[PDB]
C-alpha cells in the first residue's frame, strides 16, 4: 500500500483500505480480537498507520497497547456489573 494509492480514495474509504492491509496482520497476532483492535487502530492518523504497515515493531507496540486498553475496558465493565 502506497501513499498514492491512499490519496486516490475518500477519507472513510482510506480507512477501509488501510484496514484491509492491517487486518490480516492484527488477526494473526490476536485472532479473537482482530476486528475490534483493527477498528481501534484505524482511528489513528493515516500517516502513522502507513508507517505501522511498514514497521512490524511499531505495529506490535501499538497492537499491544490496544489489547491492554481493550481488555482493561472489558474487564472493568464486567467487574462493575458483576
Amino acid at each position: 500500500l502506497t501513499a498514492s494509492m491512499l490519496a486516490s480514495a475518500p477519507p472513510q474509504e482510506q480507512k477501509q483500505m488501510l484496514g484491509e492491509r492491517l487486518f490480516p496482520l492484527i488477526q494473526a497476532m490476536h485472532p479473537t480480537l482482530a476486528g475490534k483492535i483493527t477498528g481501534m487502530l484505524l482511528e489513528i492518523d493515516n500517516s502513522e498507520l502507513l508507517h505501522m504497515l511498514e514497521s512490524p515493531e511499531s505495529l506490535r507496540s501499538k497492537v499491544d497497547e490496544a489489547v491492554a486498553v481493550l481488555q482493561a475496558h472489558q474487564a472493568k465493565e464486567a467487574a462493575q456489573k458483576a
Binding site: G19, G35, M40, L41, E65, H73
Partner: peptide, 11 residues
C-alpha cells in the same frame, strides 16, 4: 485509544 471504536469488517 478508544475501546469503543467501530469493529472493522474485512470486505
Amino acid at each position: 485509544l478508544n475501546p469503543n471504536a467501530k469493529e472493522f469488517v474485512p470486505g
